[PDB]
């Protein structure tokens, strides 16, 4: 096998068409979804066609080398995780990799960002823990475009589809680290965040406040 | 409807077996058509099938887990066993049985769930399980949030919590995974977000601690006068 | 060389399922009726063989449990494994594995025996200990005639075990089976022979140990 | 499973004989002993067979269904669970019920004790606990009593039946608990042995 696109990064209602291939035969395909700890919740049954217990807001195809997923009435939960399965070979019960839908139609909000303080703790403990924190954005999808004296050290990889926030927006980390000495040795950090626009940032001083 | 459930350790050492647990509830095994089968997710990561058993007891599995894996079930106790040997670190992943289900002759579909499972595969360390208050906060921040957060060397077991202030202050609310590394020699961080204001200066206290074990040693923020 | 281990969690929920796996020296050698096999004992109680296996796949199994139980390895992986049924906490015992070599396929030999596993079963979960220095407050012994240790509490199940400064101060110890904390909890001592007048001159260090946790912690005795 | 007798008691000068019964085959029993709480140890083999280089006290023997057992010179530390194991039918091998061993005639000797005081953590808790260990004792028997000023045992009786040691000599521990209001208000903080009626006491203070 199967493969998939990215994130399919649009609507509120406009109908977006999510694909997989794999198997072209439409042989028991179907569509899952994976959201904040959830059960892999259904999408899509049959020979690739809708479920009995499910609403209007989805209709997958048949189609042919699209195993084509339309939806409809879109909401910021729906920024969970989409997936493509199938009846192989027998006992092969082939499943998908991924794209996570981004909601672009809801209204939206800037990100809001922390960097880690040249802090009053770490400063005894001789640490840099140069790690960025991000909130209140939607879409719910982002990245980090790190500015620093090049020193790119304890980095990181994540999946952001379970941390929505309190209010509804969402939040998420970003990873470098380093000692204490390079608060001062090294001097032009800031955390710059795009969350498919914006591009917000926050620098440090040399020591916390 | 139907009913099933997730069960087991919540780790392992290096080298030892996956021993992990679900009954069918609701339905039976002797109904036709339908079947049980196993999903797993890494942390952060995507998911992945494993096995299944159908409504004649057929089994089958991955071909690229087949001398690792193995898939049992005891009658006198109508309950299915999944089975890994090799434990290594990365296989640490949530675990899911699941209900199978089909169309016409051989057109299969899965369709319910129990609770889920959490596991982390691992070395072990609790050595010394400390807790630094390494904090994303003070004036650093533009987020509505300067959140308070604490950071970890050694701990094996699992979940983590976090505390700070009985979280009287707080705006913009989330837990963040901050950092993480080394699977059960764990050093890791996690927050609450207090607002953007100054902090590092002012005499806060702590809990990140992992439920099985209700231990930490531990410092205050206030550890230099140079925070805000 | 010839040595034997055990290894498996260090608790099991009630009516969940136990595994368990076995390594050590003496690399698969096909010798003198060579096998490994898997033996329990209930709480104080006398000795059960469960089952072993030999020096190819041939492979044997209790008639009162059958079903209970299934035996196999990856021989590749280099460890003997047990898997079973679900559990009544009645199957709570110590457990071991152990090396076997009969002859020319008669005779007994189980000519070696792992350290074992405290297999423990209950329907509750596990908890971390508490642990305190004993020292008291007012003394009267002279020379290398005292002794001192630590108290530990609050933990659920066994083992927590103590060493004397990673061992490198071992002499004159007693220890004390544990005893169950009628909360439904556990608590131990362990104590060294120390100089009554030269604490401080030296330090002695309670190194504690609890597998279920895998909490390990230092603390000073003076 | 093997039928054996449950327990032994001789004189420490005299070489005990122990049995047990193949209930069938068992001219190929071996045999095995259980010191408590720890892993058992290998005796006798084949049949009469002396096993490589462990205590050589322990004797060579054999019947033909009574499978025998014996010590030459018995000795103090020899006080344990014994055990008959055997082959049987397609590899189902079976294990005796264990015969206990007492040594008779020796010393046992009167209780070493240590009394130690609750601890600062437990007082910020409003808890106390003191700690009484009992040791070197022989028979492996105890009681114990308290004086916490004229009151009973208190939230936890938590007594050990007695237990070995390294040495043939005995062991347990008790730990009277208390609130620590409780501990401030009382002044006698006493715990005391009657092991085989014998008086011995220990006692702390601040
Ligand atoms: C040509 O064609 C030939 C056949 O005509 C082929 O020969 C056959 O080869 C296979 C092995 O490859 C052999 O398999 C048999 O399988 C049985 C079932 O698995 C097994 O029975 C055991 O039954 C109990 C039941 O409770 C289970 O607990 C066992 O797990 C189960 N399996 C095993 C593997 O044990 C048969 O067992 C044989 O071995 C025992 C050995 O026990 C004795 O020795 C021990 C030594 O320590 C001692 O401790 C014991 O006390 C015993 O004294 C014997 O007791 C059995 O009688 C039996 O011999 C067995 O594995 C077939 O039996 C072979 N047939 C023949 C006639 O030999 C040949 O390979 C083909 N070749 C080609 C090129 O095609
Ligand atoms: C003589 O007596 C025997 C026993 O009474 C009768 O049945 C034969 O029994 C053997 C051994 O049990 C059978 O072998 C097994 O067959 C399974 C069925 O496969 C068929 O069905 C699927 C579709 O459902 C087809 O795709 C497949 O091509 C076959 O047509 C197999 O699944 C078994 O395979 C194992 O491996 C796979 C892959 O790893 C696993 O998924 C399986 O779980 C399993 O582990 C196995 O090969 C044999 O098929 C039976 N033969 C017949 C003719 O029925 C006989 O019927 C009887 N003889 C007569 C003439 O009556």
């Known amino acids: 096998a199967l493969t998939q696109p990215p994130s399919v990064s649009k609507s509120l209602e406009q109908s977006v068409t999510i694909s997989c291939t794999g198997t072209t035969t439409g042989n028991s395909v179907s569509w899952y979804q994976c959201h904040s700890g959830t059960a892999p919740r259904l999408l899509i049954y049959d020979v690739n066609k809708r479920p009995s217990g499910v609403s209007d807001r989805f209709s997958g195809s048949k189609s042919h080398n699209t195993a084509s997923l339309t939806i409809f009435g879109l909401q910021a939960e729906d920024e969970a995780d989409y997936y493509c399965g199938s009846y192989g070979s027998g006992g092969s019960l082939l499943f998908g990799g991924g794209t996570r839908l981004t909601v672009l139609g809801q209204p939206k909000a800037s990100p809001t960002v922390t960097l880690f303080p040249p802090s009053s703790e770490e400063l005894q403990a001789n640490k840099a823990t140069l790690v960025c924190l991000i909130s209140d954005f939607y879409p719910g999808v982002v990245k980090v475009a790190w500015k620093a004296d090049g020193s790119a050290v304890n980095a990181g990889v994540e999946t952001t589809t379970p941390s929505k926030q309190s209010n509804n927006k969402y939040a998420a980390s970003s990873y470098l680290s380093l000692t204490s000495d390079q608060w001062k040795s090294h001097k032009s950090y800031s955390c710059q965040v795009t969350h498919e626009g914006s591009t917000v940032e926050k620098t440090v001083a040399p020591a916390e406040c | 409807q139907v009913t099933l459930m997730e069960s087991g350790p919540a780790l392992v050492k290096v080298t030892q077996t996956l021993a992990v647990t679900c009954?069918?509830?609701?339905?039976?095994?002797?109904?036709?058509?339908?079947?049980?089968?196993?999903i797993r997710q890494p942390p952060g990561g995507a998911l992945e099938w494993?096995?299944?058993?159908?409504?004649?007891?057929?089994?089958?599995?991955?071909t690229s887990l087949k001398p690792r894996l193995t898939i049992f079930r005891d009658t006198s106790q109508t309950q299915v066993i999944l089975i890994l040997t090799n434990m290594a670190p990365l296989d640490t992943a949530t675990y899911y049985c699941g209900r199978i289900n089909n169309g016409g002759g051989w057109k299969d579909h899965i369709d319910f769930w129990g609770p889920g499972l959490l596991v982390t595969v691992s070395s072990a360390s609790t050595k010394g399980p400390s807790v630094f208050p390494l904090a994303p906060s003070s004036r650093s921040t533009s987020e509505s949030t300067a959140a308070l957060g604490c950071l970890v060397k050694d701990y094996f077991p699992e979940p983590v919590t976090v505390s700070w202030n009985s979280g009287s202050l707080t705006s913009g609310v989330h837990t963040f995974p901050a950092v993480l590394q080394s699977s059960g020699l764990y050093s890791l961080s996690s927050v609450v977000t207090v607002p953007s204001s100054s902090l590092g200066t002012q005499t806060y206290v702590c809990n990140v601690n992992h439920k099985p074990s209700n231990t930490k040693v531990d410092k205050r923020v206030e550890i230099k006068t140079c925070g805000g | 060389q010839v040595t034997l281990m055990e290894s498996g969690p260090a608790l099991v929920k009630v009516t969940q399922t136990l595994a368990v796996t076995c390594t050590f020296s003496?690399?698969?050698?096909?010798?003198?009726?060579?096998?490994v096999a898997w033996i329990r004992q209930p709480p104080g109680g006398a000795l059960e063989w469960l089952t072993s296996?030999?020096?190819?796949?041939?492979?044997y199994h209790d008639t009162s449990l059958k079903p209970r139980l299934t035996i196999f390895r990856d021989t590749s992986q280099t460890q003997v494994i047990l898997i079973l049924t679900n559990m009544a906490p009645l199957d709570t015992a110590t457990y071991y594995c152990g090396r076997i070599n009969n002859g020319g396929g008669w005779k007994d030999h189980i000519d070696f025996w792992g350290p074992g596993l405290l297999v423990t079963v209950s329907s509750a979960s596990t908890k971390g200990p508490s642990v305190f220095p004993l020292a008291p407050s007012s003394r009267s012994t002279s020379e290398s005639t005292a002794a001192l240790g630590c108290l530990v509490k609050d933990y659920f199940p066994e083992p927590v075990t103590v060493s004397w400064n990673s061992g490198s101060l071992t002499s004159g110890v007693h220890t004390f089976p544990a005893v169950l904390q009628s909360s439904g909890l556990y608590s131990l001592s362990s104590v060294v022979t120390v100089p009554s007048s030269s604490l401080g001159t030296q330090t002695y260090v309670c190194n504690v140990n609890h597998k279920p946790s895998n909490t390990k912690v230092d603390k000073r005795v003076e | 499973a093997l039928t054996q007798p449950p327990s032994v008691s001789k004189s420490l000068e005299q070489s005990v004989t122990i049995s047990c019964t193949g209930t069938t085959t068992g001219n190929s029993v071996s045999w095995y002993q259980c010191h408590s709480g720890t892993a058992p140890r290998l005796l006798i083999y084949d049949v009469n067979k002396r096993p490589s280089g462990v205590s050589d006290r322990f004797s060579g023997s054999k019947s033909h269904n009574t499978a025998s057992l014996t010590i030459f010179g018995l000795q103090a530390e020899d006080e344990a669970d014994y055990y008959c194991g055997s082959y049987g039918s397609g590899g189902s091998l079976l294990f005796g019920g264990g015969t206990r061993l007492t040594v008779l005639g020796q010393p046992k000797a009167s209780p070493t004790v240590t009394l130690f005081p609750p601890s600062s953590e437990e007082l910020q808790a409003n808890k106390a606990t003191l700690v009484c260990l009992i040791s070197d004792f022989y028979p492996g028997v105890v009681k114990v009593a308290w004086k916490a000023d004229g009151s009973a045992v208190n939230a936890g009786v938590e007594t050990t039946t007695p237990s070995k040691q390294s040495n043939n000599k005995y062991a347990a521990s008790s730990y009277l608990s208390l609130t620590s209001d409780q501990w401030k208000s009382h002044k006698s903080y006493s715990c005391q042995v009657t092991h085989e009626g014998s008086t011995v006491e220990k006692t702390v203070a601040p």
């Open positions: 003496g690399f698969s050698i096909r010798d003198s009726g060579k096998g």
């Open positions: 296996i030999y020096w190819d796949d041939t492979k």
